[PDB]
Design a binder for these strands. Structure first.
Ligand SMILES: Nc1ccn([C@H]2C[C@H](O)[C@@H](COP(=O)(O)OP(=O)(O)OP(=O)(O)O)O2)c(=O)n1
Ligand SMILES: [Mg+2]
Ligand SMILES: [Zn+2]
Lengths: 179, 208, 873, 118
DNA sequence: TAGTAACATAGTATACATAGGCGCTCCAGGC
């Protein structure tokens, strides 16, 4: 239903995701930074299987989830992006469909440039910088070795709309006028 | 770095310099975006200048640093009387302002100007009240920690002519995180104990 | 931070476009825990501009240019500065105070002594125009004075000296690569405390090799060497051995693999040589090693011209990290390469001082050529083998050739270090810098105008004056004023006895005697009037007196007997350098672009010199003595005697009579010639008598101005002329002289015709004033044609100032002799080339012998032509 | 001093008479052009009209959304100095949100300074 | 709203040159 529009400052102030269940909200923002390191990995070519395979230095890769060895692999998109708005910034992690929508090129296409044309790969990463979208983010807090780390997961990205966004901004500024 | 803030060139020029920090009144600004029309552009052998205008004050100069080797975007200089969006950080020199262009984009949908002005007013109000509320010896000093000592010993031990890479360093040391490896490597390279051979991921000690 | 902080500064740096008002200092600091000296960096902020405003006497309105009949005062000037200029040019904070100053310079319509308004404010504010005018003030001074000069003259720092800092601070983040850093708030806390001995430095000498690849037309680095000394004394004798550590690094350019069992051979020979994979590895290793060693002086040959630019270009192209380690300041954007005369190279090595032996050799001694082989041959006595660039690729087949190449590079570095130590450059540079007061890296760079300018600036600042502000802004040009005088010679041969008399430091003595200075002489081509003989000594006479008195002590040290020859040579070089510095101080008064340009001040000196020479000549001629020669300060007397004691007594009497007149001027005997051959003005040869006493004396050959000392004649002609002139001055009958000369000429002609002479005795050396591409008439210029061919063929990029050798070949194309010039390598390699004998017999030996033998009866030009067998008719 | 060197506030057809002898930018819906070409009429999207005059008759064919830079004269008319036609090939422009944006801007002019404010 | 990984996260323009003086021969080439 209606998106719980919340500024990241409010998100960190009320402590979203500290409960036993994750919390869902969506917002518009502009990408400021992306990490190209460790962004590419080999997934299990078996259908509906995305476990990371292990190279056996023989041209045949064995998957532990299916207990099966295959001579080929499928690339799968994993990405960490730095989201940022007028007030605060946050670190989010994407997946195949969301990163593919953001970048605009399928993973198998990227499978070629990293092997034959690094300059074109860098250009593809470059031209997608400083873009604005609407991201649905789910927040949950997990503890690892006695510190609580807030993680962000995004499952949907969409192009920005102006009509309802402008109406919402007008409504919010009118509301703050009374306060 | 922290957060982009929409603004207007009038506020940009009215801003003041305090201890390398530009403040428009009680508002801090580091990266800004502005949407406007280009009146005139001048072509330099390397750089490109633009005359942006948002009909709030006099036209402003924007400098875009492009390397002349990359003949990709310089040949696509935007023609005049076009409304564009500019994102970047400002610079100050001898009491005349300047803008450094991180990115230039022609604007396709033209409700974006009203959206941008609403962003400007709303963000200005919110952050202005956010700052309005109150309560807001000389020795060489040497010495290396145990972790950096282990890293240096691991680098030294390898006999490969090209030296070690990051994969072997991570494999040998499972007692500490990757970020600690990066920090130790950065410090060791800064102090000159190690040097890169071919790529940024290959290293080798200098003494041996 | 603990109270005070002592350190010894060496070099300074500033940047007025990015960090205005800050000055960096790099130097050494003593650490008690390790009992050693380590590098240190101190950075100074808050340097304020200084302006001087000159009040008027009547208030003149700008629009009308008339006087309004209103008296002026300091309050009016203050109000005019505050109300109008401050608001117009956006000046917020300032301090103002009246002061007293004196002006004695070129700007007209300024009183000699007046009251000025001193205004000081921070440097971040804008800069006022250099030609400001106002209602109440007519002129302003010191608008565009740099920060470094302001700091140096305010703190009275004269070259390297011990400094102390009061109440230091601690920087938030590192700035330099030094071990210890510090911060000073104001330039008031820095004080000079120099009364103790300087500390030792660390010296590194280095050289590398290059090769040109066929595919990529760029120069690569394939081998390097370096030698380091850790405790090089600065004022004592040169340590022996001059090096304590060394290293070498080698790598394969792009494709060729190292010969097999190279590593095993290296292990067997136990040589500390590092092998690399690619060029980037070599560059990274070199940068890490220089950072670890931390040298203070880097010495090499042709550093500024070729080596540094190639190194920086390869660092840029190979994308090596941390390029700033070659200096001492953390920087990321490298300055534009090449650019102007050494600006980028000097800026790249900030904090580290570069010593090029070529410039020092040019300044100190005189040679026929300035490549390393000639310097080794002359300064030392050894032979250096040269490896052609073509063979380099072929030496990548066997390990022995690679080891030989590395040994050759190491030997080259050792030769460079030995030459630098032998010439004794560092103590001389330190002494000159301490005398003048500039930055001693600029002293190592070269040039004579900057030293004099800084010396005069210090002298004027210390004496409460105002100095002129800086101006905004090839071959010898036309003369501007009358110079010296040369007497009419008396050509011929003299046999009885010749006496020579000469003044000591003529021009400094003139300046000191007649009290000639900027302040004293009143200037309105007309020679001004002499000063009134009741005033006091000016600044220039005192500076000249100090500089000329610094030389008498060195001469006194020279006069001591029982000295090793090398020490005598060093002392002679030092004394000559001091004399040249004094003469340059005189001559800078005529430089058009100088900061202290004044033409009459030198015309008066030259006029007095000519007058004194006239008076001396008349006085000597009055004593019934015959005068035959004189060159603007000297007199030749023909005593026409044989007894030596009579000549000595006559010279003593003449000296006593002449010295009786003047106050500071002195005369002396410069030599006694047993026999003299005079040809023209400034051209003669004689036997100088060296009195060893004990009933005997030794005669030594001397030449002045002949075509035997020039560098543009072949060696064969020079040798023949030397032999002939040696025969002429001998004590024999004239007929025997004629017969011996004829026999020698016939033998020379026969030998040259037979072609038995070596190839080496045919070269002609010339130098280029400009770049080889800037000569429109390259068709008829041989030394330009050969230079262009060398530049276009291979490398080494010969430029202005270098020497080009050439020979004349016979190409069988019936062209003129001037268009058939070829390099020696072309003659040796190509087969359709041979030495042109007729040209060498007709245009190189015949004119020299004819000119030398002109004043001797019995030998004529036609007889010379017939003797050589050059088709007599 | 040319007009592009001075601030130009965004004023709609509502307050034409309150900015007399003042530079002003206007945008909106083209309605009708006089046959002479020296002047035409404009719509603000609220049913009100505003007329614009030029010193020289217009030479090019105009259509769609247009903005005009000018000054309010004694007759509350706009002496245009320049104009730009707005694109309508891809996305419609909703003038109502623009109008309320002007209202909000006039409501809090302090956070949208006009000219150089010290 | 399963499946994914591993464990924190980055500065970059530019602008600014030095160089002591004059006097007295040599050569190459055209007129
Ligand atoms: N490189 C030089 C050499 C000489 N001179 C001028 C200025 C001197 O006053 C004059 C005489 O030079 P001398 O070589 O005779 O030297 P000094 O007389 O100055 O000194 P010394 O006593 O060593 O002969 O020539 C000069 O301007 N530049
Ligand atoms: Mg002399
Ligand atoms: Zn599987």
């Amino acid at each position: 239903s209606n998106t719980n529009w919340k500024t990241l400052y409010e998100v960190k102030s009320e402590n979203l995701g500290q409960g036993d269940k994750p919390d869902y909200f969506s917002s518009v923002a502009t990408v400021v930074y992306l990490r190209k390191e460790n962004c590419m990995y080999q997934a299990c070519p078996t259908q509906d299987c995305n476990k990371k395979v292990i190279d056996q230095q023989n041209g045949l890769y064995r998957c532990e989830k299916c207990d099966t060895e295959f001579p080929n692999f499928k690339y799968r998109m994993i990405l960490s992006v730095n989201i940022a708005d007028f007030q605060e910034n946050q670190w989010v992690t994407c997946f195949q469909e969301s990163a593919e929508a953001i970048l605009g090129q399928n993973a198998a296409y990227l499978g070629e440039l990293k092997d034959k044309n690094e300059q074109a790969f860098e250009e593809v990463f470059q031209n997608a910088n400083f873009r604005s979208f609407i991201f649905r983010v789910r927040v949950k807090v997990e503890t690892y070795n006695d510190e609580s780390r807030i993680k962000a997961t995004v499952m949907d990205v969409k192009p920005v709309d102006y009509r309802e966004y402008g109406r919402r901004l007008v409504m919010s500024i009118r509301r703050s006028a009374l306060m | 770095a922290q957060h982009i803030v929409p603004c207007t060139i009038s506020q940009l020029l009215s801003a003041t310099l305090v201890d390398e920090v530009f403040r428009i009144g009680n508002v801090e600004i580091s990266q800004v975006t502005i949407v406007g029309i280009i009146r005139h552009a001048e072509k330099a052998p390397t750089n490109i200048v633009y005359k942006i205008d948002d009909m709030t004050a006099a036209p402003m100069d924007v400098r875009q640093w492009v390397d002349t080797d990359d003949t990709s975007s310089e040949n696509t200089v935007v023609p005049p009387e076009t409304y564009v969006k500019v994102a970047g950080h400002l610079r100050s020199f001898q009491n005349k302002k300047s803008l450094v262009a991180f990115k230039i984009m022609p604007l396709e949908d033209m409700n974006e100007f009203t959206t941008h002005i609403l962003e400007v007013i709303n963000a200005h109000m919110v952050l202005s009240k956010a700052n309005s509320q109150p309560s807001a010896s000389f020795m060489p000093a040497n010495g290396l920690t145990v972790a950096q000592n282990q890293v240096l010993n691991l680098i030294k031990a390898c006999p490969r002519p090209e030296g070690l890479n990051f994969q072997d360093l991570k494999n040998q040391l499972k007692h500490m995180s990757v970020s600690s490896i990066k920090q130790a490597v950065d410090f060791l390279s800064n102090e000159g104990h190690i040097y890169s051979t071919v790529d940024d991921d290959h290293f080798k000690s200098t003494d041996a | 931070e603990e109270q005070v902080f002592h350190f010894y500064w060496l070099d300074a740096y500033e940047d007025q476009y990015n960090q205005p008002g800050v000055v960096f200092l790099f130097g050494k600091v003593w650490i008690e825990s390790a009992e050693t000296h380590v590098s240190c960096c101190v950075m100074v902020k808050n340097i304020e501009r200084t302006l001087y405003f000159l009040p008027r006497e009547m208030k003149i309105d700008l629009n009308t240019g008339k006087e309004t009949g209103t008296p002026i005062s300091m309050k009016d000037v203050y109000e005019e500065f505050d109300e109008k200029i401050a608001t117009k040019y956006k000046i917020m904070k300032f301090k103002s105070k009246p002061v007293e100053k004196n002006y004695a310079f070129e700007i007209p319509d300024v009183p000699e002594k007046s009251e000025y308004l001193e205004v000081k404010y921070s440097a971040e504010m804008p800069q006022l125009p250099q030609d400001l005018k106002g209602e109440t003030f007519s002129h302003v001074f010191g608008t565009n004075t740099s920060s470094l000069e302001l700091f140096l003259m305010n703190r009275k720092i004269k070259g390297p000296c011990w400094l102390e800092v009061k109440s230091p601070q601690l920087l938030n983040q590192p700035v330099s690569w030094c071990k210890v850093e510090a911060m000073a708030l104001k330039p008031d806390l820095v004080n000079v405390i120099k009364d103790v001995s300087p500390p030792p430095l660390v010296v590194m000498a280095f050289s590398m090799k290059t090769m040109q690849n066929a595919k990529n037309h760029q120069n690569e680095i394939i081998a390097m060497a370096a030698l380091v000394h850790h405790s090089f004394a600065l004022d004592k004798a040169a340590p022996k051995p001059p090096f304590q550590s060394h290293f070498c690094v080698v790598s394969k350019p792009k494709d060729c693999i190292f010969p097999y069992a190279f590593k095993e051979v290296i292990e067997k020979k136990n040589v500390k040589v590092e092998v690399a994979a690619t060029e980037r590895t070599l560059l990274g290793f070199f940068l890490a090693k220089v950072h670890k060693i931390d040298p203070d002086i880097i010495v090499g040959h042709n550093i500024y011209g070729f080596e540094l630019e190639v190194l920086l270009q390869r660092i840029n192209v190979c994308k090596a990290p941390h390029w700033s380690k070659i200096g001492r300041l953390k920087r990321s954007n490298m300055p534009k390469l090449g650019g102007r005369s050494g600006f980028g190279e000097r800026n790249a090595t900030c904090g580290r001082m570069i010593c090029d032996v070529e410039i020092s050799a040019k300044e100190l001694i005189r040679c026929k050529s300035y490549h390393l082989s000639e310097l080794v041959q002359q300064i030392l006595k050894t032979e250096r083998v040269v490896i052609p660039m073509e063979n380099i690729q072929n030496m990548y087949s066997e390990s022995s050739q690679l080891l030989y190449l590395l040994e050759h590079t190491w030997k080259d570095a050792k030769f460079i270090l030995q030459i630098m130590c032998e010439l004794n450059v560092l103590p001389l540079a330190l002494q000159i810098t301490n005398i003048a007061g500039n930055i001693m890296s600029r002293t190592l760079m070269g040039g004579r105008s900057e030293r004099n300018e800084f010396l005069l600036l210090h002298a004027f600042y210390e004496n409460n004056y105002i100095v002129p502000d800086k101006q905004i802004f090839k071959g010898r040009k036309k003369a501007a004023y009358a110079g010296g005088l040369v007497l009419d010679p008396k050509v011929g041969f003299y046999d009885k006895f010749i006496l020579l008399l000469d003044f000591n430091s003529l021009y400094p003595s003139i300046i000191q005697e007649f009290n000639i200075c900027f302040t004293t002489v009143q200037r309105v081509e007309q020679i001004p009037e002499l000063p009134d003989p009741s005033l006091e000594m000016g600044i220039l006479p005192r500076e000249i007196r100090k500089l000329v008195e610094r030389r008498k002590q060195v001469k006194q040290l020279m006069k001591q007997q029982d000295l090793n020859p090398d020490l005598i040579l060093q002392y002679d070089i030092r004394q000559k350098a001091l004399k040249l510095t004094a003469n340059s101080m005189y001559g800078c008064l005529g430089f058009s672009y100088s900061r202290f340009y004044a033409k009459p001040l030198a015309a008066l000196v030259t006029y007095k010199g000519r007058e004194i020479l006239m008076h001396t000549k008349e006085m000597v001629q009055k004593m019934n003595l015959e005068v035959i020669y004189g060159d603007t300060d000297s007199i030749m007397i023909n005593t026409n005697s044989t007894n030596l004691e009579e000549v000595f007594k006559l010279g003593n009497k003449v000296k006593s009579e002449v010295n009786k007149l003047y106050k500071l001027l002195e005369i002396d005997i410069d030599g006694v010639f047993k026999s003299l051959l005079l040809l023209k003005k400034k051209k003669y040869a004689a036997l100088v008598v060296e009195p060893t006493s004990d009933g005997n004396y030794v005669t030594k050959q001397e030449l002045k101005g002949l075509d035997i000392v020039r560098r543009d004649w072949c060696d064969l002609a020079k040798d023949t002329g030397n032999f002939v002139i040696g025969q002429i001055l001998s004590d024999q009958s004239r007929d025997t002289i004629v017969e011996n000369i004829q026999k020698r000429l016939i033998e020379i002609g026969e030998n040259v015709l037979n072609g038995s002479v070596p190839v080496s005795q045919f070269e002609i050396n010339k130098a280029l004033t400009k770049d080889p591409q800037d000569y429109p008439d390259k068709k008829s210029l041989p030394h330009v044609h050969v230079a262009l061919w060398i530049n276009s063929q291979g490398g080494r990029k010969v430029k202005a100032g270098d020497t080009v050798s050439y020979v004349i070949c016979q190409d069988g194309s019936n062209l003129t002799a001037s268009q058939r010039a070829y390099a020696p390598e072309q003659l040796q390699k190509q087969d359709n080339l041979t030495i042109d004998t007729q040209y060498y017999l007709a245009q190189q030996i015949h004119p020299v012998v004819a000119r030398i033998c002109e004043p001797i009866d019995g030998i004529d030009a036609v007889l010379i032509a017939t003797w050589l067998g050059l088709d007599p008719t | 001093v040319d007009m592009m060197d001075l601030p130009r506030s965004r004023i709609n057809a509502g307050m034409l008479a309150q900015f007399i002898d003042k530079p002003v930018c206007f945008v909106g819906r083209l309605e009708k052009i006089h046959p002479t070409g020296k002047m035409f009429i404009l719509s603000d999207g609220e049913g009100k009209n505003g007329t614009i005059e030029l010193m020289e008759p217009l030479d090019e064919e105009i259509s769609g959304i247009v903005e005009v830079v000018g000054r309010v004269t004694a007759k509350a008319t706009i002496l245009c100095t320049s104009y730009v036609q707005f694109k309508e090939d891809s996305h419609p422009f909703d003038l109502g949100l623009y109008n309320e944006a002007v209202k909000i801007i006039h409501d809090f002019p302090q956070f949208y300074p006009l000219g150089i404010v010290q």
